[PDB]
Every structure is written in structure tokens, then in C-alpha cells.
């Protein structure tokens, strides 16, 4: 899946549950 995601766009990235928790933690801090 990683090969097909960045097949064309350099600036493409992936987000998952962990990022969300880091944000709600960043907000709460």
C-alpha cells in the first residue's frame, strides 16, 4: 500500500489513530 500511496505525490503522508491522540493531547496541553 505504501508504494501506491506515494507513487506520484512527494508531499503525500499518512495519518492514523496515534496522530489524533497526539493532537487532543496537544490541545489539552
Amino acid at each position, epitope marked *: *500500500n*505504501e508504494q501506491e*500511496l506515494l507513487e506520484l505525490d512527494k508531499w503525500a*503522508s*499518512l*495519518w*492514523n*489513530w*496515534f496522530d*489524533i*491522540t*497526539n493532537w*487532543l*493531547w496537544y*490541545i*489539552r496541553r
Partner: antibody, heavy 133, light 110 residues
Framework: EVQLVESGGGLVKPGGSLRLSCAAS????????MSWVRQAPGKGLEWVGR??????????EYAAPVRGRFTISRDDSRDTLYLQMTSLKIEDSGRYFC????????????????????????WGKGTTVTVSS | DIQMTQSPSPLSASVGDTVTITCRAS??????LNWYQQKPGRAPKILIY???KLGSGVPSRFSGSGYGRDFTLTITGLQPEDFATYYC???????????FGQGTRLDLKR
């Protein structure tokens, strides 16, 4: 489809080392947290250790009985997870499962924002290890 | 560390019967609990996470509840396929221990 295939299990003498590996398919390995879980014969499940995405730094956290002896790594280049077991004991024998984990952010209560609910979502058939002289 | 206790190993039940599995905990874990199952010779599967939340693809007969220290897994309509062992798991420690329960096998009533 979506599956995990463990391999590399077999016979090894006490104090020896052994390397397991799991290949993944059907989902984005790089954006997924991975864990190992072992099961000794006739006994219950026991968490071994987990690893995070490379985007997070590939932080590894282990269970006390294996801490210091085992090492977990990943190779997103081939969607493969590894478990490097060294200084093996008789008590390390069992069926080692590989797992793709998931987290659920805490939402309802504000003062717990940051924590999450961790669980084992996908499992492989497993591979048996046997430590015996 | 957090320990997890569970119902007696073989609890007996017949088809179409409601069963419950207690999962007493040593320490207060709010609702950071999961439930799994593994059929006699297959890989474990996820059923309930966050104490109550139901995993995708899980039949609606399974239902979990509890908060803090006492937890339960209920299977209202018992079916033959789900004759297996069930494990509850802790997920509360800031430093992950992820200790599993002892397990609970389902015995065919006779």
C-alpha cells in the same frame, strides 16, 4: 486478502538465539502498529512487545519477562516485522503470533485526551518455537 | 502491576443459553479493557474493546460492560461456532503491560 504470515520457528537450544519474521498484506504496514503475542502449550495468551510506525520513531516497548533479551524491528520496504530472540530459555517455547494493533483515542472525557484504547485487531496463524537441550 | 482474574476454566452451557464471564481486576482500569476469542485451533480474534465497544465483523450477540474493576462478557444467544476460549486484557498502564486474562473455556453441557 488481509493476513499475517509468521515463519522461522523451530528447534533451538537453551541460551541460543532465533529470529522470527512476519510478512503483511492487505493493509498499509507502514501506518500500522505491530505487536508480538506468544502462547505456551496449554497456557493462555501473553503479550511480548510492540513497535510503532517509522513516522513515530519506531519506539519499541517490551514485556518484562522478555525485556533485555528480545528485539522487535520492522522493514516497511518489504512490509515485514521481525522478532530477534537471544539468550533463549525453556519458558520462551510456545506459539508466537504476530499482530497488527489499533488504537481508539479517548474522546468522551477531556482530562484523558492523549491516552487511547489499545487492542489486537489482526492475528496470524502463528509459528511454534521449541527451546530444549 | 495489574493482574486479571476470570471465571472458572470450564463453564458449562447449552445452545441458546445466556452466559457471563467475570473479569475482576487488581487495580482500577476505568474502561481500558478488551475481549478476545480463539477457537480450539485457530488464531485469536478481537470481539470487544474499550470494555463495551464492539469490533467490526463481530455478531451482536456479544456484549461487554463494566468500569473500574469489575467487567463482564455476555453472549445472549449461544451458537455452536462460538464454542471457544475467551480472554480479557488490560490496556490501562501508561507503561504498557497488556496482561491477558487466564482464559475461560466453554464446556458443552451434559
Amino acid at each position: 486478502e488481509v493476513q499475517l504470515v509468521e515463519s522461522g520457528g523451530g528447534l533451538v537450544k537453551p541460551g541460543g538465539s532465533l529470529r522470527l519474521s512476519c510478512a503483511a498484506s492487505g493493509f498499509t504496514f507502514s501506518n500500522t502498529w505491530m505487536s508480538w503475542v506468544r502462547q505456551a502449550p496449554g497456557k493462555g495468551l501473553e503479550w511480548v512487545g510492540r513497535i510503532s510506525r517509522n513516522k513515530d520513531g519506531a519506539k519499541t516497548e517490551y514485556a518484562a519477562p522478555v525485556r533485555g533479551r528480545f528485539t522487535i524491528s520492522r522493514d516497511d520496504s518489504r512490509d515485514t516485522l521481525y522478532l530477534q530472540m537471544t539468550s533463549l530459555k525453556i519458558e520462551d517455547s510456545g506459539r508466537y503470533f504476530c499482530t497488527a494493533d489499533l488504537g481508539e483515542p479517548v474522546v468522551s472525557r477531556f482530562f484523558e485526551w492523549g491516552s487511547y484504547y489499545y487492542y489486537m485487531d489482526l492475528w496470524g496463524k502463528g509459528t511454534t518455537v521449541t527451546v530444549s537441550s | 502491576d495489574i493482574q486479571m482474574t476470570q471465571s472458572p476454566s470450564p463453564l458449562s452451557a447449552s445452545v441458546g443459553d445466556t452466559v457471563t464471564i467475570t473479569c475482576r481486576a487488581s487495580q482500577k482500569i476505568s474502561d481500558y479493557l478488551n475481549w478476545y476469542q480463539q477457537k480450539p485451533g485457530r488464531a485469536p480474534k478481537i470481539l470487544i474493546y474499550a470494555a463495551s465497544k464492539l469490533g467490526s465483523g463481530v455478531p451482536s450477540r456479544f456484549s461487554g460492560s463494566g468500569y473500574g474493576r469489575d467487567f463482564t462478557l455476555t453472549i445472549t444467544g449461544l451458537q455452536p461456532e462460538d464454542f471457544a476460549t475467551y480472554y480479557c486484557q488490560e490496556a490501562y498502564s501508561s507503561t504498557p503491560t497488556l496482561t491477558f486474562g487466564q482464559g475461560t473455556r466453554l464446556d458443552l453441557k451434559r
